[PDB]
UniProtKB/Swiss-Prot annotation, chain A:
Protein keywords: Nucleus, Repeat, Ribonucleoprotein, Ribosome biogenesis, rRNA processing
One Gene Ontology term of the molecular function aspect: snoRNA binding
Miscellaneous comment in the UniProt entry for this protein: Present with 7520 molecules/cell in log phase SD medium.
Subunit note: Component of the ribosomal small subunit (SSU) processome, or 90S pre-ribosomal particle, composed of the 35S pre-rRNA precursor, the U3 snoRNA, and at least 40 protein subunits. Component of the PWP2/UTP-B subcomplex composed of DIP2, PWP2, UTP6, UTP13, UTP18 and UTP21. Interacts with U3 snoRNA. Interacts with MPP10.
GO biological process terms held by the UniProt record: endonucleolytic cleavage in 5'-ETS of tricistronic rRNA transcript (SSU-rRNA, 5.8S rRNA, LSU-rRNA); endonucleolytic cleavage in ITS1 to separate SSU-rRNA from 5.8S rRNA and LSU-rRNA from tricistronic rRNA transcript (SSU-rRNA, 5.8S rRNA, LSU-rRNA); endonucleolytic cleavage to generate mature 5'-end of SSU-rRNA from (SSU-rRNA, 5.8S rRNA, LSU-rRNA); maturation of SSU-rRNA; maturation of SSU-rRNA from tricistronic rRNA transcript (SSU-rRNA, 5.8S rRNA, LSU-rRNA)
Gene Ontology CC annotation, any one: nucleolus
HAT repeats: 86-118, 123-146
Protein family (similarity comment): Belongs to the UTP6 family.
Location(s), subcellular: Nucleus, Nucleolus
Superkingdom: Eukaryota
Section covered of the full-length record: 2 to 147 of 440
Chief site of localization: nucleus
Protein name, UniProt field: U3 small nucleolar RNA-associated protein 6
Biological role stated in the UniProt entry: Component of the SSU processome, a pre-ribosomal particle required for the maturation of the 18S rRNA from the 35S pre-rRNA precursor.
Swiss-Prot record, chain D:
Function: Involved in nucleolar processing of pre-18S ribosomal RNA.
Other facts noted in the record for this chain: Present with 1470 molecules/cell in log phase SD medium.
Compartment list: Nucleus, Nucleolus
Family statement drawn from the similarity comment of this UniProt entry: Belongs to the UTP14 family.
Stretch of the intact protein here: 836 to 897 of 899
Protein name: U3 small nucleolar RNA-associated protein 14
Domain of life: Eukaryota
Membrane-traversing stretches: none
Subunit structure of this chain's protein: Interacts with snoRNA U3. Interacts with MPP10. Component of the ribosomal small subunit (SSU) processome composed of at least 40 protein subunits and snoRNA U3.
Organism: Saccharomyces cerevisiae (strain ATCC 204508 / S288c)
UniProtKB/Swiss-Prot annotation, chain E:
Protein name, per record: Nucleolar protein 56
Further facts: Present with 13500 molecules/cell in log phase SD medium.
Entry's family note: Belongs to the NOP5/NOP56 family.
Shown segment, full-protein numbering: 3 to 56 of 504
Subunit details: Interacts with NOP1 and NOP58. Component of the ribosomal small subunit (SSU) processome composed of at least 40 protein subunits and snoRNA U3.
Physiological role: Required for 60S ribosomal subunit synthesis.
Localization per record: Nucleus, Nucleolus
UniProtKB/Swiss-Prot annotation, chain G:
Native organism: Saccharomyces cerevisiae (strain ATCC 204508 / S288c) (Baker's yeast)
Entry's transmembrane regions: none
Additional notes on this entry: Present with 5800 molecules/cell in log phase SD medium.
Superkingdom, taxonomy of origin: Eukaryota
Subunit relationships: Interacts with snoRNA U3. Interacts with MPP10. Component of the ribosomal small subunit (SSU) processome composed of at least 40 protein subunits and snoRNA U3.
Subcellular location(s) per record: Nucleus, Nucleolus
Covered range of the whole protein: 52 to 101 of 554
Described function: Involved in nucleolar processing of pre-18S ribosomal RNA.
Protein name listed in UniProt: U3 small nucleolar RNA-associated protein 7
Amino acid sequence: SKTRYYLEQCIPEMDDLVEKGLFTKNEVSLIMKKRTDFEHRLNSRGSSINDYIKYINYESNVNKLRAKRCKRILQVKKTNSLSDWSIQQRIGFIYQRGTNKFPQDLKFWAMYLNYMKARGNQTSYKKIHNIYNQLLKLHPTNVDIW
Amino acid sequence: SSLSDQLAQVASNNATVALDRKRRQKLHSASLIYNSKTAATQDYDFIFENASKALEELSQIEPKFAIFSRTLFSESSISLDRNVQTKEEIKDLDNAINAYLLLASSKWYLAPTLHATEWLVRRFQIHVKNTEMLLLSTLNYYQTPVFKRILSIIKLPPLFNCLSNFVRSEKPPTALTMIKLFNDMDFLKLYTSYLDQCIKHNATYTNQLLFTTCCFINVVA
Amino acid sequence: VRKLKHHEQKLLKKVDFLHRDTQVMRTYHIQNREDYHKYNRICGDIRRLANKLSLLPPTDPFRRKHEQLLLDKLYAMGVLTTKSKISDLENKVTVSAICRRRLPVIMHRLKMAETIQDAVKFIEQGHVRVGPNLINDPAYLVTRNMEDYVTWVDNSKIKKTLLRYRNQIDDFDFS
Amino acid sequence: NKKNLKYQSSAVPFPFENREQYERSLRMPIGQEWTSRASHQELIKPRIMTKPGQVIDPLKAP
Amino acid sequence: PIEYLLFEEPTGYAVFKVKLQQDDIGSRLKEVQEQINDFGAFTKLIELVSFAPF
Amino acid sequence: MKIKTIKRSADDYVPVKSTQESQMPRNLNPELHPFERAREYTKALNATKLERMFAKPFVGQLGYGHRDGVYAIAKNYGSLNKLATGSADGVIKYWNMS
Amino acid sequence: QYKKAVSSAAATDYLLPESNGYLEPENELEKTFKVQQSEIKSSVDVSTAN
Amino acid sequence: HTKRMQHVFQVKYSMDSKYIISGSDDGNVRLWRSKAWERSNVKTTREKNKLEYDEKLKERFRHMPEIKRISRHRHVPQVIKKAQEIKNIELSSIKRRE
Amino acid sequence: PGAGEANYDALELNPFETKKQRQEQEVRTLLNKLPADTITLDPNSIGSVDK
C-alpha cells in the first residue's frame, strides 16, 4: 500500500548506489529488508516515536557507512550522484512524517531541530523558520521553545 | 505408525516456527511477567532493553554473567532466529542456554533474574525448545508465583504429569505431589544427571540442596 | 462463502455450490438425505407409471389388469388404505406416507417407544421382532400384516422390566 | 482457431487515431499486478481533474 | 473557500486548517452527513494547526 | 559444494507484534501474472455493470417550486450555492441550493 | 509509455524480497550428481531439514 | 427524464461542474448529478485509485460489443422511443429518394 | 537447491494467509473469474479490431 509507495520511491537511489561500485547486490537487498521492516512498522497502527527514532538512526548509520565506503573504495570525498543527498532527503522526510503524526513529543521536535541546524550548511534559513513556526503554533505556551 | 502419529512428530519438530499470524501471537504471548494482551502487543526492542538493564544489575551482583552479555544479549541477539540456523549452531545455543540456566538457578528471588529470563524465553523460545533444563533449574522454588507462571506457559515433557494436573489452577503444587514426581524412577535418573552437572560446575547452593535431600529422604520413606 | 455483500450479490447472484429434506429429518426423523431422495424418487416412479398406464388405451384388459395389480400391491404394502380410486394413487402417495410406514414410526404409533430416536436406539440394540425374526435396520418398511404382528424379542431387559412393572413377570417363559 | 467476434472489438475507441495505436496500447496493461505503483497511478490519472467544492472561473491569460 | 476555522473550548482556543471542502450543493445528502459523523473522513477534511490553552 | 536453499524468516514475513501489518511481497514477473487481456476485460465489464447499478441521477428539488412553470434560470457565476429562478406568474426567487 | 512501464518492472526487480538457491561444484574432480540427501540435510538449515 | 418533469425550458450547468439544474414548466427546479455515479463524499485514496482505474479500463474497452450493449442500455420513455423510430423512418425515406 | 521460485507474489498466492485474507481473496477471484470460452490458443486474441 502506502508502504509500497515509499519503497518504490526508495528504489532509484539504490539503483545508483549499486551501479557505482560501492555496494553489492546482496548488501543492498539486506538494506531493503530492513527498510521494509521499518516502513511497515511506521505505517501500521500502534507505532511510536521510538519507531520513528530507530528508523532515523538506522538511516544515519547507513549514510555514514556509505560515506566511508566511498572514501575508501574510490578515494573520492563526494560522488556526483543522486544518493549523496537522497539519504538526507529521506531523513528529512522521516522527521516530517513523525512530527505530523505525533506533534506532542518535544524531544522529537528537538531532535528534528538539532539535526536540521547541525546540517545547516546546505539547509534553509527558511526551513528553520518553517519548523519553528509550526512548533510555536502548536505549543504557544512553552517559554522554553520561545 | 499411523499418519496421525507421524504428523504429531512433525508438529513437534516445527513447534517453534511461526507459520502464520495466529500461531505467532500464541508463541509471542507466552511470557513470564506480562499477561497475554501486553505480551502480544510489545516488541523485541522493549523486551531487550529491559533485559539489558536487568542483566547489568545481576552482573553487578556477581561478575559471571558478563559472558552472556557478550554472547546472548547483544543487538545481534535481537537479530538472530532459532529456526534458520544449522544443527551445529543449534547445539551451541543449547549449551549456552543450559549454562545460563545453571547460573540463574541461584537468584530466582530477584526481579532482575525474572526480567532477564523473560527475554530469554521470549526470544529463544526456551519454554518450548528446552523445558527440562528450565524446570530442573527452578524446581525447588515450587511455592512461588514465578514457578506457577512457568507451569502456566510451559508444555510439559512426559515426566512431569503431576505438575500437568496442577497447571492453570490457583493453588501451588504440594509436597506430596513433588514426592510422587521424585518417586518415579526415570525422573530420578534425570535429576541425578542434573546434580552431576551442577557439581562438576561447582554451582550448588543451600536451598537447592535442601530440597534435593528432603525429596530423596521422602522417596525412600 | 462469506455472506457476500449487496453489490457482489448483484453481480454473482447464483454462485453457491455448497429444505423439505431437513424438515422431514426433524419431524419424523428419517435417517439420511439420500433416504429422503430415495422416497422422492419412489413417488416419482409411481407417478410416471400412472401417466404411462393412463396413456395406454383405457379400454384394454391388459392395462386395467396391470392397474389393479399395482394398486393392490401398494395397498398390501400399506402405503395407502383405500382401493377404489386411482386419483388417490396420483395424489396421496407421499414421502410422508412412506415415512409413517417406516418401522420406528410404527413402533411409536403402536406405542413401542415413546420417541422416534428411542425407537431407533432399540432397533440398534436388537429388541424388536417382526413375526419370527428380528430386525436391526430401522429403514424397514413393515407390510400391513407384519406390522400387525410386530412385538419385542423374548428374554430382553425391556420386556422383563415391562412385565416387572405390571407384576406379571413369569419366569417359566424366561420372560 | 478462427478468432471470436464476440470478444473481437468493433471500432477504434476515441483517444486513438489508428488501429496500430490501438493495438500497441492494448499491448501495454494497466492493472496493479503488471506495473509498479507509480506507473499504475500515472496511467490511471484522468484527463480533467477538479477540486471538490470550488468555483471554476473561465481562463483569462493574454 | 473556508480556509480556516476557530473552535472555542473550555480549555482554550483551537484553530484548524481546512484541507478539503465538502461540496457545497450536496451538503444535505446522506453521504456527506455520514462522513461528518465518521472519524476517518473528518480527518481528511480537517487538520488541527494551533491550540492556545487558557 | 557451497549450497543454500530458499530459507524464509518467519520474523520477516509474519510480524512479531499483532497490530503491525504483515508485509506483502510483490513480484512483477509476467509469467507469474498470467492473464492480462481476459482479466482486464472482465474487470472492465464488471465495472460497467456496477455503473449501471449505481446510476442514480436525481438528487433533489428546490423547495416547493414555482406556481406557474419556470422560464428563467440564472446561476451566480461568482458563488456556488446561488441561483435565481423566475416564473410566468411574475414571481422571482433566489435559491440557496446548499 | 510501454518503455516506462517495463523500466518500472525492472526497478521492482531490485526490490524483490529473496534469492534463489543453488548447488555448484567449486572444483573439477567432484560432480553435482554425486551428492546425497543425507549430505544436503547435514549441510543445510534446520527448517528445511524438517 | 421523469414522469414529473415536462417541457424542459431552462438548463444550467453548475459552477463546480458537478451538478445540473433544470427548470421545467410544471413549475419545478430539479437538480441532477452530472455523472450519475460520483457520490459527493470524500473518498479514501485506495477507493479513489480503484475508481479511476475503473474509468480508465472502460475507456479502453469501450467498443467491445458486450460492454457497449451494457453501457448503452438506458431506459427512455415510450414517447421518445416511438418518435425516434418514426424520425429514423423519415430520414431513410428522404435519403433513398435523394 | 534451486527448484522453486524463491520470491512469490502476495496478490496471487500467499503461503501465509490469515483466514480472513483467504476468504476475502476467494470472493475476489470469484468476482473476476474469466468466462469459460475465453480459453483460446493465444491469450491476446481479445484485443484486436474488425468492423
